[PDB]
Scaffold this active site. Structure first.
Site, PDB file in Angstrom:
ATOM      1  N   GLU A   1     -19.137  29.750  43.366  1.00  0.00           N
ATOM      2  CA  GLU A   1     -20.235  30.012  42.452  1.00  0.00           C
ATOM      3  C   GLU A   1     -20.202  29.161  41.190  1.00  0.00           C
ATOM      4  OE1 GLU A   1     -22.955  31.555  42.944  1.00  0.00           O
ATOM      5  OE2 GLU A   1     -22.474  32.835  44.671  1.00  0.00           O
TER       6      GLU A   1
ATOM      7  N   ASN B   1     -33.137  28.685  37.611  1.00  0.00           N
ATOM      8  CA  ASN B   1     -33.868  28.668  38.875  1.00  0.00           C
ATOM      9  C   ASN B   1     -35.341  28.498  38.508  1.00  0.00           C
ATOM     10  OD1 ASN B   1     -31.517  29.422  40.671  1.00  0.00           O
ATOM     11  ND2 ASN B   1     -31.534  31.208  39.302  1.00  0.00           N
TER      12      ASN B   1
ATOM     13  N   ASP C   1     -38.204  30.736  40.126  1.00  0.00           N
ATOM     14  CA  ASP C   1     -38.608  32.085  39.766  1.00  0.00           C
ATOM     15  C   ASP C   1     -38.348  32.451  38.306  1.00  0.00           C
ATOM     16  OD1 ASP C   1     -35.857  32.455  39.736  1.00  0.00           O
ATOM     17  OD2 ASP C   1     -35.980  34.375  40.793  1.00  0.00           O
TER      18      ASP C   1
ATOM     19  N   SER D   1     -35.527  32.597  36.568  1.00  0.00           N
ATOM     20  CA  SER D   1     -34.355  33.414  36.297  1.00  0.00           C
ATOM     21  C   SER D   1     -33.200  32.449  36.115  1.00  0.00           C
ATOM     22  CB  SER D   1     -34.077  34.377  37.457  1.00  0.00           C
ATOM     23  OG  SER D   1     -33.635  33.687  38.610  1.00  0.00           O
TER      24      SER D   1
ATOM     25  N   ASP E   1     -28.741  32.075  36.427  1.00  0.00           N
ATOM     26  CA  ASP E   1     -27.464  32.588  36.926  1.00  0.00           C
ATOM     27  C   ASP E   1     -26.449  32.350  35.818  1.00  0.00           C
ATOM     28  OD1 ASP E   1     -28.436  33.141  39.546  1.00  0.00           O
ATOM     29  OD2 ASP E   1     -28.319  30.999  40.013  1.00  0.00           O
TER      30      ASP E   1
ATOM     31  N   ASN F   1     -27.297  36.823  38.389  1.00  0.00           N
ATOM     32  CA  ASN F   1     -28.703  36.585  38.082  1.00  0.00           C
ATOM     33  C   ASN F   1     -29.388  37.549  37.091  1.00  0.00           C
ATOM     34  OD1 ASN F   1     -31.839  36.667  39.120  1.00  0.00           O
ATOM     35  ND2 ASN F   1     -30.977  34.598  39.204  1.00  0.00           N
TER      36      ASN F   1
END
Length: 130
Positions: free
Chosen positions: A35, A46, A49, A51, A53, A60
């Protein structure tokens, strides 16, 4: 902070992650590795959308933490996403535990499915004394 492998393994063990909801320490290691590369300050936007991380487990903002800029999002961990960017991973771990309390468990992270699920992940904790 960018953790050393064994340093993180012991830190996670001390935080009660070994076997949390049936998930072995080696699996959490494999998750953090893929990750973020064990980087607590890693962030990923991202565009698709709106959002982002955050941190070592790349949690998220749509569901887990609040950053104020994600559309119709929630904050299940009840933390500012800023909390997921600290060198001290206690909050991020508390939140990761919250994530796995849901039905999917560790499967919540697609990267875990792609690079950890069904594999020999022992290598991640070897020599760490955990």
């Amino acid at each position: 902070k960018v953790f050393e492998r064994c340093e993180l393994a012991r830190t996670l063990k001390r935080l009660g992650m070994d076997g949390y909801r049936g998930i072995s320490l080696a699996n959490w290691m494999c998750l953090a590795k893929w990750e973020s590369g064990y980087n607590t300050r890693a962030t990923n936007y991202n565009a698709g959308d709106r959002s982002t991380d955050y941190g070592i487990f790349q949690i998220n903002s749509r569901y887990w933490c609040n950053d104020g800029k994600t559309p119709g999002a929630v904050n299940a961990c009840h933390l500012s996403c800023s909390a997921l960017l600290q060198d001290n991973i206690a909050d991020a771990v508390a939140c990761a535990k919250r994530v796995v309390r849901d039905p999917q468990g560790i499967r919540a992270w697609v990267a875990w499915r792609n690079r950890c699920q069904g594999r020999d992940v022992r290598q991640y904790v070897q020599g760490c004394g955990v």
